[PDB]
Amino acid sequence: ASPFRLASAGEISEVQGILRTAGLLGPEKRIAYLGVLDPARGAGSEAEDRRFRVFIHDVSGARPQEVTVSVTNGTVISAVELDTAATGELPVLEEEFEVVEQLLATDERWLKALAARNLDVSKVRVAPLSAGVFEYAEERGRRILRGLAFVQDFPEDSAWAHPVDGLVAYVDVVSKEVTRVIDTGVFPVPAEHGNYTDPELTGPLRTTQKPISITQPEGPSFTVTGGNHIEWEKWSLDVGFDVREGVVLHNIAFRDGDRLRPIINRASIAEMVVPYGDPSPIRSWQNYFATGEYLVGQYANSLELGCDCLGDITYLSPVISDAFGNPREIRNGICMHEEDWGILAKHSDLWSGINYTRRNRRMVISFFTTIGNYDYGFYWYLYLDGTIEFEAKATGVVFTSAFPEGGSDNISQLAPGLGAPFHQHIFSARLDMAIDGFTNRVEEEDVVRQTMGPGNERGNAFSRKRTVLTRESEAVREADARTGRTWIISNPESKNRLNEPVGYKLHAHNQPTLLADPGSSIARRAAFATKDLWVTRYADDERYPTGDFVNQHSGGAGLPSYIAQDRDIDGQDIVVWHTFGLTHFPRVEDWPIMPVDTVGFKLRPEGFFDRSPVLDVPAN
Amino acid sequence: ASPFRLASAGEISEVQGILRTAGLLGPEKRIAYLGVLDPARGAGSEAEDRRFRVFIHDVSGARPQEVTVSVTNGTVISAVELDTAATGELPVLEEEFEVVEQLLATDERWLKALAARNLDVSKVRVAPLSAGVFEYAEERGRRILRGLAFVQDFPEDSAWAHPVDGLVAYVDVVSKEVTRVIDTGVFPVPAEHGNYTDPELTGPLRTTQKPISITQPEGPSFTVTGGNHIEWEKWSLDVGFDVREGVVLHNIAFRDGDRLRPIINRASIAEMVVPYGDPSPIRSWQNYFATGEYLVGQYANSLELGCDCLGDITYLSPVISDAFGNPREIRNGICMHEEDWGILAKHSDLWSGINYTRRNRRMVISFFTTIGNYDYGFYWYLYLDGTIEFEAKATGVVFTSAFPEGGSDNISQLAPGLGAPFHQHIFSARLDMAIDGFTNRVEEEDVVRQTMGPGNERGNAFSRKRTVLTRESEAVREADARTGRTWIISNPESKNRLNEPVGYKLHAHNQPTLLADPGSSIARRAAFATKDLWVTRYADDERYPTGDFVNQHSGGAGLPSYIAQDRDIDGQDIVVWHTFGLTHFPRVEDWPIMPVDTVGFKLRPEGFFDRSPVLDVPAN
Ligand SMILES: [Cu+2]
Ligand SMILES: [Cu+2]
């Protein structure tokens, strides 16, 4: 009966029925997004009304709509017509990916470009990439996708090994017409194949790896109730799933003695953008928001036991809607398990003669998604000591291009004639804080060096300083690794036994943020990625750092607009948005399939407890 | 027969015999340090001549000596008298530790200070801390230790919970004289106990943790031959142990096809210092060089199966010398095992229909040491993909003090009246590089942002630059996380199939470096800690960033002096010295025993291989 329970296949089927009956789901309509709405602030309203938010696309060219329906009452709460040229286009439909390659296949300009390169059109795959917004005036209001070509020699061939550079096309997926085909010149299509399962490339497989058996003879230490409510080593939370954000953690709390203390109300990766840094007109427009434009949850993989998740795994199989409102189950799309995490605490004391050692553990909640050539793993970790951590694992096949004769300052060579354009993978973690309640505040903590002199005659002293962020206008912060800068979220009304406000400290990896020029389209559309940390006043409609309709939006939506309200965040219901990412200069080692690389962040208790919260852990 | 084999009990006894025969080890002598000497560069002697280096202390006050002997030929190669007042005192002897408390127990000044605080001398433990170099003229040429007091209420009581602030004494451990007793005033001695094994504090132990079983039915995948030669998943290396540095990795190489390719000739933590930032006269002199002054290997813990090292573990039991030259085994002092490391590579390709997933693994070589209140774990990891990583784990009990009534800018409060002085844990990793051989060079790589304009009209382009460090004078580098700065060690004479010099990229955590004022004693003595990266030309006698004798030694030796030679490091036999550490502002959560915190670095291949080196990893 939990208001945070996962959507059922029936609920999605009910939304479909409601929409159809209301006349909002005709033959020309398509569901571009469908997700359950979280309970509003204030559970005073007995029995929560299960509501779903829906983005309805019209393949006829008619205006799309944002609809809210109550599955509890079987009614349409609201239906608003959208002006895409103003507020942005709806997310890309899976069924739209195909149209790009199919439409180009009969376009004379495209066929001529391929003929010149002696490429069989039946062997040319086309990657359907988001368009963004640039100098093409005829695109505003129009739903466009840009296509880049790759040759697939045979059904099981990895097309990524054969990019067709010097060629790009733009297509209007609704009017179904190729608006433009640009051919800047022929580039040799890389010849070597990148088939990592081909013995000629892998060579003899290793026979040196002995098995590692990870088991739990008495089962897991965590309990799953209500389908998605998790309880593990004092932790309490609800694992939700949204087609846009993927796995979302709700009501993260820690049982400290006799009371369940909240830490974070909602944690999610609210956006993920991959900006490319190759100035070639063939790719200079390339920026794909996996979350905002494509909806990462939608492409979550079914995780195979023993391969994707090892040990004693408890799966969750979330259900999403297809383009027509039919429920589709993502079998084993979410993995949950606990794993040993080395030494937790250790000390051999000479004076007391007591030797003490305790092991650590982490609760893991994860899912893996595939976006064309890339595959991303999203992992949330809960540690015994109260630490919360997120880790993104980037793998898959690198997006390729030709490697220019004479080299390049924006592309690396991975194989003969094969290039890999420089790019970044930048995430935004939206953390709706609730440190011992909703009355929170954020402080920027910097290490402070001291000069040798009076009060510090030996010049050994060093300190720290904390600055409270009181208004949103001063809540857009940058990292400063040199000064060990961190951010503390505390509750000025809840103090520990030492009369100090309880808190949690966010430790960032301090990786580079968005590198693009400040005046670029991407810097405007993904402004969140230009700064490491943002703090906003909580608001029901401020869900994504990039706004609700990212696709082809002119820019400034999301965080820049929210922050413009300059609201009070000093001891209020606030939300922390942390930007973190990888800057990728592909290596030869990343080809033909790249080894996982990682990035993340974590929050550790900072005077939240009255002493170590793991003194009750057994020797085992 | 391997010249990189661990020292045997026999060799140590032989050294003792040689020294005795040479008249260098009479009853007044003590071995302060003893270690095997690594073989010199180039195949010198027809066979392998085993040599040991020893620092001989004299308990009567006579000048100590540095001696090198050949255990094979039974001769003293060299023996030099040391002028400690100039070049430094020898490492602290374990037997000198107790001298401090013993001598103070009968000193009138000390007794009066304790009486003024109503403390029973029989219950006052004294921490024997390194003295360093300050303004005390009488200390020149004397082996001094400074003592700080802690009250131990009973045999199994954690004295750290009861610091006696406002009091410190200096002691000459050779002449057995208390040179000074400083009392700046009485401070209340914190009353609360910090006994983490007392049920009154731990409360009932958790019964919610279910067992996690990690086993290897067919045994480990790595082989150990010649006692310490490891071969695992293409990696090859020798695990050495030195009483000063602890675990040292030799000849790290990777089998790429038919050739064994060297990567790192020698890897070790050449120094680690813990500088305190409390300006109080009671502790403003506190800086302990665990490695250089105390010799961390000496205090390596015997690691218990299931507790310290979980899974299928293979142990090494290194042997060291005791103060008299007798061999002493550190039973199970080194743990070696492989562990699963999640997903290695993964891609679900729509076009080819091929779904691919491979898991990762890492080889772990570690040891754990105890220095008074702190306990440090040293971990070296080797991954399937060629990555090499080091991780230090800091735990134990925080060093305490009283917490001043009016608060403090250099101490945090852990409990009523109990303080924890701010401090840092800074390590120095000495990496004698050998990327495909000894002809190496280092390049500093920074991300390069580009301005929007001609050639980059959309302002999306970004690049990078590499600067070769050609001379030691330009090889003292700082971190720059904002620009994603890394350092690449390459071999300009060994190129991959794409005609690019093979290399490895060092990824630092970019944590703050030494915070002390540049004019402080510690900034001079721990000069290496002020910069993130140093590159020197290899030399037989340049072993530690702080020189051979750190104890009570001024600046003048170590890295700053090595760099002054301004030698050519562009395509030469070079050594990388990486500084990395933790800046600790103790939290209430760190008391009464602190949960592990970590810091480290890693090196990933950068065009070292011609493609991913893990394509031959099997599915299962
Ligand atoms: Cu990438
Ligand atoms: Cu510390």
Curated annotation (Swiss-Prot), chains A, B:
Keyword hit for Secreted: no
Positions of substrate binding: 288-299, 371-376
Alphabetical list of InterPro entries matching this protein: AGAO-like_N2, Cu_Am_Ox_Cu-bd, Cu_Am_ox_TPQ-bd, Cu_amine_oxidase, Cu_amine_oxidase_C, Cu_amine_oxidase_C_sf, Cu_amine_oxidase_N-reg
Active site: residue positions: A290 (proton acceptor), Y374 (schiff-base intermediate with substrate)
Residue positions, PTM 2',4',5'-topaquinone: Y374
Cofactor note: Binds 1 copper ion per subunit.
Signal peptide: none
Gene Ontology MF: a single term: quinone binding
Catalytic activity line of the entry: a primary methyl amine + O2 + H2O = an aldehyde + H2O2 + NH4(+); 2-phenylethylamine + O2 + H2O = 2-phenylacetaldehyde + H2O2 + NH4(+)
EC number assigned by the record: 1.4.3.21
Keyword Disulfide bond in record: yes
Cofactor(s) this protein cannot do without: Cu cation; L-topaquinone
Residues bound to Cu cation: H423, H425, H584
One biological process term in Gene Ontology: amine metabolic process
Modification after translation, per record: Topaquinone (TPQ) is generated by copper-dependent autoxidation of a specific tyrosyl residue.
Superkingdom, natural source: Bacteria
Enzyme class (EC, first level): oxidoreductase
Cystine crosslinks: C309-C335
Keywords: Copper, Disulfide bond, Metal-binding, Oxidoreductase, TPQ
Purpose of the protein: Catalyzes the oxidative deamination of phenylethylamine to phenylacetaldehyde with the concomitant production of hydrogen peroxide and ammonia.
Family: Belongs to the copper/topaquinone oxidase family.
Subunit annotation: Homodimer.
Name this protein carries in UniProt: Phenylethylamine oxidase
Species in which this protein is naturally found: Arthrobacter globiformis
